[PDB]
Amino acid sequence: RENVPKKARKAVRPTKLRASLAPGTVCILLAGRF
RNA sequence: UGUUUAUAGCCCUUGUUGUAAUACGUCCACUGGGGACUGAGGACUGCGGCUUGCCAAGGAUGCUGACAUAAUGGU
């Protein structure tokens, strides 16, 4: 019956990064191999 | 022991600095974050907003990963 998905009203917008995450900042890695 | 700001000061009233501050009550169709649960519906209609179009506006989508010899679900 070829169910067509309804037109979702979600659109992608830029992520609002944290204030303290400025470029050129020292930071600690919390996961991964490093 | 007794006295009246002196070599400490205190209390009361008024003026002033004053439209003083603050506490508190209340309101903002003011705003900035953190966490959890949920994704029902299934072309288009509607009510709105910004401007043919776009949108947070009649219910989730997007970007990725890992794993299939296991993860999940069981019995």
Swiss-Prot record:
It comes from the Eukaryota. It is found in: Cytoplasm; Nucleus; Nucleus, Nucleolus. Signal peptide: none annotated. Belongs to the eukaryotic ribosomal protein eL6 family. Component of the ribosome, a large ribonucleoprotein complex responsible for the synthesis of proteins in the cell. The small ribosomal subunit (SSU) binds messenger RNAs (mRNAs) and translates the encoded message by selecting cognate aminoacyl-transfer RNA (tRNA) molecules. The large subunit (LSU) contains the ribosomal catalytic site termed the peptidyl transferase center (PTC), which catalyzes the formation of peptide bonds, thereby polymerizing the amino acids delivered by tRNAs into a polypeptide chain. Component of the large ribosomal subunit (LSU). Mature yeast ribosomes consist of a small (40S) and a large (60S) subunit. The 40S small subunit contains 1 molecule of ribosomal RNA (18S rRNA) and at least 33 different proteins. The large 60S subunit contains 3 rRNA molecules (25S, 5.8S and 5S rRNA) and at least 46 different proteins. This is Large ribosomal subunit protein eL6. The gene is rpl6.
